[model samples]
Target: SMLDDNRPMDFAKDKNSATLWAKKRKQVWLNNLSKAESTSINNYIKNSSEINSYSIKKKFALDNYEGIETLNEDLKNISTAVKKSMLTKPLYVYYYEANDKFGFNQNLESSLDSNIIDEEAINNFAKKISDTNFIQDGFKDVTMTEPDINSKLPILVHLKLPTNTPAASYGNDEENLRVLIDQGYSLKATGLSIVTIKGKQYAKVDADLIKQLNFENDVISASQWGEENYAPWLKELTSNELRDINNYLGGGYTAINKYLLDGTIGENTSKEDLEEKISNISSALKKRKIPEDIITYRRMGPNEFGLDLNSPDYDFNKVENVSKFKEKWLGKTIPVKTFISTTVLSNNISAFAKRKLILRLHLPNGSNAAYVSVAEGYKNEYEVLIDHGYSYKIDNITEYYDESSLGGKTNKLIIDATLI
Candidate 1:
């Protein structure tokens, strides 16, 4: 009786349904593979014997190798490097003032005197705020305005970064480290309104209060995205400009990296060991009848490209699909979804570029859930036209009556199917 209502439709036994299912699933598969493939190629190279073939002197040239696929934009590709840096567990600490409209919120303000005025002062300030009644009863109906998503008021510290340094002399590089810390802190401090009580000002701050704060060598590296100055080793690293150009044109390190690392693009796997490993993986993939085109590059349809490749004129279709495919594949494998958890809306109709609302989908089942979280930037008329597949519809849209909601907006869609 239960199966009669919610039975798994056996598309495998039906011709039309199977075809439609395959077509839809193919898109999902492609999207997933595209996001994941690059990271796999990168991880493969990091673990492969060939990576070690280069001498310690040749380690920097690891970027030059055949396996690491470059992205469509240098910055996006470089983000992978940053992602790898994070994988190394670099310390990323964020310091902030409590009850302030700093980088992450509005109406709260950061303290004007930005330096770590006094550690005890800050600690006491934070402790007092944490122990306060305002947040204890919950911040529902609280409203913030002109929030700065980036302010130096909040400093996030990553304990993992300072693991190698001597604890006693950790703060020696305080000057250099403070620069990086201030960058994060400044980002957090942005758009905050300072709260003054009894001539003393305070702002909002967040911490892993339950977890103990561990400080290593207070020295921080300049390898992160918003760093003011990069380290000497990082300076030699390609500029974001060079990286972006490489990714955009699909011409440089990305092409070379994918080939070198994954042994994709028919790379020179001259080494006997690498040749054997490639042969093995290829065999395993083939035995599964997993389409080789899925593993390698596949050209998009004219409809998908929205251009003709054989045209004599500027064939935008000439833009290679390989890089796009690779990046998408890697993204799926290492899915990095930053769900906003709230809607952010812009009231100005003239500002076409601004998002009217933001939504971070924490689906009930996390990543494995069937429903895909979607965010749209336009008004109702435009949103209604945006199809969310055959089984789902934009059932309802609701704006926040007050400013307390995340992104200052909300939407409720009633799906035809129970995706939950």
Candidate 2:
């Protein structure tokens, strides 16, 4: 996930001029709001000062516009119990027992908690989460949303294969196919083929098997499931992938920059694998510092990132309150305690609709970032990876609706945080 660290409720650039800008945004939320870095501060200050006596509630009231419907619209799907629990808390994080460490998402559960009431509390919380100094974390946001138990379109299978094996056994040998079905894999032979990772070629039946899946959805599903249920051989295969990805990438992969690393690192990922990979990725991110003309983007689950999103002084819909919050939040420097994955050129959206934030990094020169094309050179899926200890300044947090396919045509509570 692109942990979107939002600035805070309606925070305009400067504290004194914030309210005017707040009213300006509260007015402008009627259409599209600020693009932050791209929009001139002068333009904002000029128009922001136009409101003579801004009526905050009336402008941001749910009844003020049809667009405001998204917040409530997105809420309808959540169970009352879960919503209540979330509303009752402000932060949620993965509790890595022995690590005695914490990573903060700064996403308020509901803004109802005292932790989010003012600037000092917010800064303290940010510092607490950032102090961990992590380059990557082991936890991944997991779900079994796609193939309900009724469907098996995507599944995982682990098998043993001979070292220095011949690719001819991929699907060509009857004994091999029978052995695969004998072990557990009865996948379609048509899609089976040879693959090369780190200059070593392996048969499709080398270690793992998945049936009828696309790279994004089912493949990710396989990776998640494989994370927990992988066998030793599969670990070797995925282990190679993880190691190779950390390297300068292998031949024929030059054009793509970073290659797709599927499958979890098996059993020790949380223990030893995590330690090593985190160190490597941290070093990798440090190697690629931020530069001119680059904007980074990432989507994060606020409630889920350290399990953190909503209230009156904190009522996000009202822009003025956000200004005060941002005024407090700005200048607080915090490190991203995990692999801060992001898009270098553009942004995107996804949903469970509850506590999601989109972080747009208007990176200053000298900031660290590890970039990867993630797809073909011509594709828009290119991504940049950032590591821990990269301190960034809080800029802004504004509400917006994002297009999502899973739960709704439009998802609610999308917080866009501008980080400098």
Candidate 3:
């Protein structure tokens, strides 16, 4: 009954029934993700005390968004717990993403933060499924705010900025991520809470909506809304931002050169160690530099972007077989140990973007043979590095020539490979 009659029924009102429904819903979801993965992730969720939370800890190391499964925002409805907690609290908060000077700017910000954050994080920010379209759409039109149901957002009728990645590295705390609900808004439960960081305990909504304060000229005093409901949230969000800016400062090149100090990713480098350094690298880049450069193009697309992108060494390209990697890579399992870089380009890649196709590389025996004619940002485009020691078998190679964007007859070579 908590949900509008127009909306389909979701969770039961009681704690016991809600949980039972939730478990069944969650299990059916997990089953869709290649069975074994379903069991693994399901067990992790079952073992955890916090079943309402949706996060990577339960998803483990997601190599790509495909590795992730979406639980409808409605699932939160089954939880009588969130609904109870929201009783006195107002529901349906409004999240607005300022359309910078352009939507391209918004998507750019998204690709760096959300695209790298998690599927949920990125999808929430972009608000749409397509990344490139997000840019052009932005280039063509613009957005202010809307009372709608995006691909995500759950019961509770939530909201956040286009750039706000609630699950991002440093600033993911509730204090920083979830903004407050405006007055007079109808309520619902967002199966999340301050303790849960998968997202703000809210999602974009419609029912109790339609709060567009018109009057192109009539603005009023700050009556009931002020630091009272705002102060605490400011503290959490700002504190997290300050922490990110503070920590990621040297959180910078310190981690960069430390890993690169030897001029090459030492064979001893570890996935976790690299992950630590990567966080620092990203923080520094995101928190410090020209937001655009950090758009490591290799990690785009559904399968390309995720925690799975990494190489044993940053100085990897220094090797010779850059041209011969593909020739040898075909029909053989190449180990990550020899330090090979494979290119997994995202859909809707920018015009003239260059990528290195490591065709049929072999291990034992390791290698690939494609060289990239990339410049500027395109440099990192060819290498969507995977974990060290993960073996890959090239499935097929499709090579075609055509000029699609702002360039010459570029060769499109797509290498289909399997991770073993």
Most lDDT-accurate candidate:
2
The TM-score leader among the candidates is 2
lDDT score at residue 40, model 3, on the 0-100 scale: 35
lDDT of 1 by residue, 1-420 (tens): 222233222221233432333333323333443345445334323442332221111211112233223322221322232232111112223233332221111222235554323445454444333211111100001101212244444432211122211101011222111101100001111122233333334443432212111111111210121122112222332344223322322333333334433445545334553334333322221221111110000111222222353433212122333223222221121211111111111111222212222121112111111100111111221110001111111111112111112212212111111111
- Predicted candidate 3: what Cα RMSD to the true structure? 23.3
lDDT for each residue of candidate 3 in 1-420, tens digit (9 for 90 to 100): 222122213221232443333334333333344444334334433432232233211221112223224332212222211222121222223332232211111222224443123345434433322111111100011111222333232322233222111111011221122221111121122232211124323322322222221111111211112112223422333343334323333233344334532434546656566556544333322321111111112211212211122432211243433224334443445453322233322232343233323232211111221111121223223332222245555433333332333212334333434444
Return whichever of 1 and 2 wins on lDDT: 2
Ranking by TM-score: 2, 3, 1
**Candidate 2: minimum summed lDDT over ten consecutive residues — where?**
176-185
Cα shift from native, residue 257, model 3 (Å): 11
* Per-residue C-alpha lDDT of model 2 across residues 184-291, encoded as one tens digit per residue: 111111222233333322222212221111111122433332233222322333444445344433332221222222224444234354445555555545544554
Per-candidate TM-score against the hidden true structure: 0.20, 0.33, 0.21
lDDT of each: 0.23, 0.31, 0.28
Worst lDDT run of 10 residues, candidate 3, spans 133-142
Error (Å) of candidate 1 at residue 38 is: 20
